[PDB]
Amino acid sequence: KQSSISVAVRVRPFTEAESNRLVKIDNGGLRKIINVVDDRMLIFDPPETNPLTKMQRNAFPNSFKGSRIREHRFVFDRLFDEDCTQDQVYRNTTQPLLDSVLDGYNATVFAYGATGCGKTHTISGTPEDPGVIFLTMKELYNRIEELKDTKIIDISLSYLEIYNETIRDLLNPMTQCKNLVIREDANNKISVSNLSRHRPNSVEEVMQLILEGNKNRTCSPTEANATSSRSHAVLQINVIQKDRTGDITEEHTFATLSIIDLAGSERAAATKNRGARLNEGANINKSLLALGNCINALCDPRRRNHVPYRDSKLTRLLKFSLGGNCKTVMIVCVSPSSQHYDETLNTLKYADRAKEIKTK
Amino acid sequence: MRECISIHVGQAGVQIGNACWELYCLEHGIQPDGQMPSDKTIGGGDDSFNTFFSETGAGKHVPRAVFVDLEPTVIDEVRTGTYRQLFHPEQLITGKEDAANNYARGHYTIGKEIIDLVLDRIRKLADQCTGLQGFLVFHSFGGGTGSGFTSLLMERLSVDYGKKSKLEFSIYPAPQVSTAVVEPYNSILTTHTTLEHSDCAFMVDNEAIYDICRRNLDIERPTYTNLNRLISQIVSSITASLRFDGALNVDLTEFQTNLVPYPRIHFPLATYAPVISAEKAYHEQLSVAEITNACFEPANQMVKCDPRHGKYMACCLLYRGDVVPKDVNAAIATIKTKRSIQFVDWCPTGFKVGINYQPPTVVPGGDLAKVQRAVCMLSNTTAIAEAWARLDHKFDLMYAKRAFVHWYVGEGMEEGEFSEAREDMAALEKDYEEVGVDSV
Amino acid sequence: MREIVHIQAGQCGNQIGAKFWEVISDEHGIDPTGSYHGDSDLQLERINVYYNEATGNKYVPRAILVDLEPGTMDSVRSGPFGQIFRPDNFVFGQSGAGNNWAKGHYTEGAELVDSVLDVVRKESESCDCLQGFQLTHSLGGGTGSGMGTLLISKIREEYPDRIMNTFSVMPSPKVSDTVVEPYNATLSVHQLVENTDETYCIDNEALYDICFRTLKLTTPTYGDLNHLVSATMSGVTTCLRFPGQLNADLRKLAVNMVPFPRLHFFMPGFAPLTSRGSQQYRALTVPELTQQMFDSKNMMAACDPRHGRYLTVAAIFRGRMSMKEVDEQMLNVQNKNSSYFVEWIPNNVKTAVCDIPPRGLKMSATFIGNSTAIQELFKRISEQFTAMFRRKAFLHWYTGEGMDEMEFTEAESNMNDLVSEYQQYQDAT
Ligand SMILES: CC(=O)O[C@H]1C(=O)[C@@]2(C)[C@H]([C@H](OC(=O)c3ccccc3)[C@]3(O)C[C@H](OC(=O)[C@H](O)[C@@H](NC(=O)c4ccccc4)c4ccccc4)C(C)=C1C3(C)C)[C@]1(OC(C)=O)CO[C@@H]1C[C@@H]2O
Ligand SMILES: Nc1nc2c(ncn2[C@@H]2O[C@H](COP(=O)(O)OP(=O)(O)OP(=O)(O)O)[C@@H](O)[C@H]2O)c(=O)[nH]1
Ligand SMILES: Nc1ncnc2c1ncn2[C@@H]1O[C@H](COP(=O)(O)OP(=O)(O)NP(=O)(O)O)[C@@H](O)[C@H]1O
Ligand SMILES: Nc1nc2c(ncn2[C@@H]2O[C@H](COP(=O)(O)OP(=O)(O)O)[C@@H](O)[C@H]2O)c(=O)[nH]1
Ligand SMILES: [Mg+2]
Ligand SMILES: [Mg+2]
């Protein structure tokens, strides 16, 4: 029908240091496991190897040593191939949400991806190629400017993080996690308490706030990367609005735009250090599983009787920011190099759980 | 020499090892304290026991074993029981909780705390061996330790040794009987290590051995001791060729050459035919023909699968006792005449035969009777795939709702892996459906 | 090596703990003085699980007694086994909670929680390896419920990766010794659902029914109910202390019993229970224990399992027995009563076996069920809670101790969500 929860998957382009280092075998190595067939259809680990017949004959009932098939057919609500730039990604993914946020209903964006996948490029980007966040908030401020007449709008920015099932205000540190408690107001609004709500007046102020918040994010060394993040960062923009010259009254309408940068799944990778690292990884994996279960239950019409919102703090915080009323989009960023092969598959599987489209 | 190193992972493996080493000590005349009295009585120097024991200067015999578990209870029972003085004191325990029945805890978090000690002890044992033949790994698919730690250990062994044989004597989950809710997850996640690293995996389910004990041995209340004793008899019959002379000796390499047609089809079914009570030891001739026919009956199989629903791709018979080759030839001809035992068209020969002159030794207080003849049959057949398919169904019933998955992902495991292993199992099943089809 | 730190809170928890330590001391041969006068080596093989060694060949139980009034502490000290406990582990205040959750959780309990946690840390750091904790208390009370929840939360913060059991005595619908039971029970269930791995629900009504019907006792007292709960508690942790054919620790039970992280409210029971003058009329075998375990009347939580579906079950047997008999009996129970078991779990019954039966009995078994019927208890509490909260019957006693009505609303919503979650797995699918 419509199924408001939508999945858009973006394939990173090969870096210059990647192609020359890897493409030698084609003329690690450049297998290019990801291959886009259509805007809703891709292949993972295809039989694109040219000298494959000599063993594909053995794959038949002649010699049972390579009969395993890893060619995976994947179907998603939207795809972005190597040549896709940022502008049309912003148009297809987050631009319609700006209507809903201004219509009265909330909106939600997730950003998921493993290490070396290009998530930071997509959400943040560079000063010359701004990411999705900058474009979205710039368009929001623009639409405020056009709608300045006959309607007054206020913007409230908050930015928190979830870490080991505890909440931390990024913009107001040295606050006890016990103070930041999730509630449920009678008007179906979550509004976690004791958050330093800021009223930026321009997109530049929003980006500055995002930078100071990222400065306080929880990261750790001694992994595949020395800054891979260990927590789910949630940025909420409350758009309040009321009529200027019309029915001037205390009543008003307000909505929320949520943007969630998710920490990738963890496999320990024999971290002899372990220690907190294990607990952090376990909590991250449990939160990801809870979010996946919530999304799958929302997309499934049979299990709509109960959705496990209470399983994790992240799911509880977005109790009224995932359902049919709210618009949810999910940006899954994957890399085409074999160096991250298994990781990419895991990421793709996490994208598949949202809607099991078996009828390709 | 013909050394073999036995590894016992988990409670099931350790108790099977207790039975196995009881049987070996009785077979070779070694006392529970490690002293063989034949050296003081006869003089020694004319015996073959290097396959399972190492001599010291004092005359003591130390078994070539590595008892490993993630809890102390079972190993402490071994260290306090009758055989406390037999084994070397280096029996490995993690000084913490066990895997608690999940693959992730025993593979990623707790299993990596004692892996180095196990590999070091295996290195020390292998260094003492001049003619090491292979490894005999005992564990259970359903257990957390027996799955996760076995997977880790076999990965390390394949990396380090590689060319040496590795035999899996595992306990597979039964179709209906079970003793844990999360058996399907642990068993499915063990597919990779038992498919890619093991060279020949023997699978047995308790239900079949319970039925054998009920019907053959006339025991209405069997316990795990009897099951372990039967499995010990099987392993002894397998390894008898390395220890005693015989008309047709069959070592591990010849066995694998004759039984494994393709690298992936290495999951045979084991059978001990002449299992009978002492009361029924009489009233029966138990000649070679009767025992060989008894091997093929679907009731006597030790995995709940019907060979009639598949094709016998290969078979190896290992006889013990008063057996002549002509009797075995007549028995094989009688089997080949039968129509219900269907063989694949691309294996006209079919049967490998080995004969040994040492009859089986009865353990006092056991169930099996003293028999002049015995045989162990190991058959690679396509029916075993059915035993997997049932398990796969169970896995699906738990994985649709992601039940118990949070326990696994909270111990350093990705959610996607659950699917991947399942796919591997499915692929394996397809192979077992493709080998059996007749040629064009 | 798998050390358990036992914590007692409130009158009910302290009494159950005293009886529990009497039972365990009898099991391991420890005398009231603390010296070991047993007759089997196995009893000393795992004495370290519950006891700490002391210089003059003594065994001090690793127990922590907590309260906010000294009367129960004096009663336990004057008891037959009072001399076995460590005097430094008796932590108590002077002003009681007044059967008020707020006093025991915010004002009066917050002062004593620091001392209790100091003693808890001192006990924990002496363990070679800590399996987890084990709390006994009652949610319908004051100091017991509030202190238990506060200690649970703080210990969970300090020891996030350790098992946290809880033997909580639920309020009965019929039996009621307090008027403000629903508020305390709701505010305690709001905390237990978030910060525990296992919660063994016990109800005084069910224990009284067991005493009247199964045991045919004429005048049961709290001693008999504590005896039943003691038998349950000893049965749960039997594989840690004695060898068996199939071992099962607390973590293994937590893994098998719990399908989803919030469904950890278990229904306990003890298998051999008969009158004094009726043991001679029955053979003690595995089918008898099996059919007594799954019987409705033997449950200790005041629920009918026939009104729901068993999400999962565990049976921990004790004695010399055949694994075939146990497996066949569990399979037969599953097949015969397939209506009361969820279809999306192929095997709902975990089995564990121990080789050392309790002194006296030739055989025994402990049942730990996990079924949807437990939701009924919560529903009953809600049926009272709202009835006291729409009109705010006794709310000022709670708001006078710094509490807000928002906490009441959050607790009610959380319990309702738990009930809905349990109900979701009741419809056939
Ligand atoms: C002559 C005879 O057979 O004596 C039995 C007995 O008559 C019965 C009725 C016993 C008896 O129990 C009761 O009458 C009883 C009363 C109130 C509450 C609970 C039980 C017995 O008291 C209980 C006692 O049980 C034990 O000794 C266990 O080890 C038990 N420990 C204690 O009861 C205990 C004793 C002294 C100090 C502290 C505790 C136990 C149970 C589970 C786990 C660990 C320990 C036994 C053998 C008996 C008597 C004495 C009459 C029963 O006991 C249990 C708990 O299994 C009740 O039904 C069983 C079956 C027995 O046949
Ligand atoms: N045949 C046989 N099977 C056994 C024996 N002991 C245990 N098992 C099997 O083992 C399975 C349970 O897994 P275990 O191997 O005991 O688990 P574990 O290896 O101790 O690892 P943990 O779960 O961490 O304790 C059961 O399904 C039993 O059927 C035995 O003595 N003989
Ligand atoms: N669409 C794109 N076009 C051009 N270069 C890109 C694109 N996406 C990613 N890159 C480049 O590819 C590299 C990896 O992307 P990047 O966004 O830095 O991932 P990352 O954030 O550093 N890894 P991680 O921190 O674990 O998410 C960088 O050099 C990016 O500039
Ligand atoms: N089993 C048992 N239950 C008790 C005992 N004393 C009280 N209770 C139950 O616990 C409730 C009272 O709780 P209480 O122990 O007084 O809480 P506290 O005062 O805060 O410690 C009552 O409703 C009783 O049903 C006891 O000795 N044994
Ligand atoms: Mg980066
Ligand atoms: Mg074990």
Coordinates of C-alpha atoms in Angstrom, one line a residue, chain B residues 2 10 26 66 143 177 192 198 208 281 324 327 330 355 392 396 403 405 412 423:
Chain B
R2 CA 50.3 -45.0 15.3
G10 CA 31.9 -30.5 27.3
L26 CA 40.6 -52.8 30.2
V66 CA 42.8 -33.5 26.6
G143 CA 25.8 -27.7 24.2
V177 CA 13.6 -35.8 22.8
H192 CA 30.5 -24.4 9.6
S198 CA 36.2 -31.8 10.2
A208 CA 18.3 -44.2 18.7
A281 CA 23.9 -64.2 24.2
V324 CA 37.2 -65.4 8.0
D327 CA 32.2 -65.4 5.4
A330 CA 29.2 -64.4 1.4
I355 CA 39.1 -57.7 9.8
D392 CA 16.2 -26.9 10.2
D396 CA 12.8 -21.6 11.6
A403 CA 13.3 -15.8 20.1
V405 CA 18.4 -14.0 19.9
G412 CA 29.6 -10.8 20.7
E423 CA 22.1 -21.1 4.4

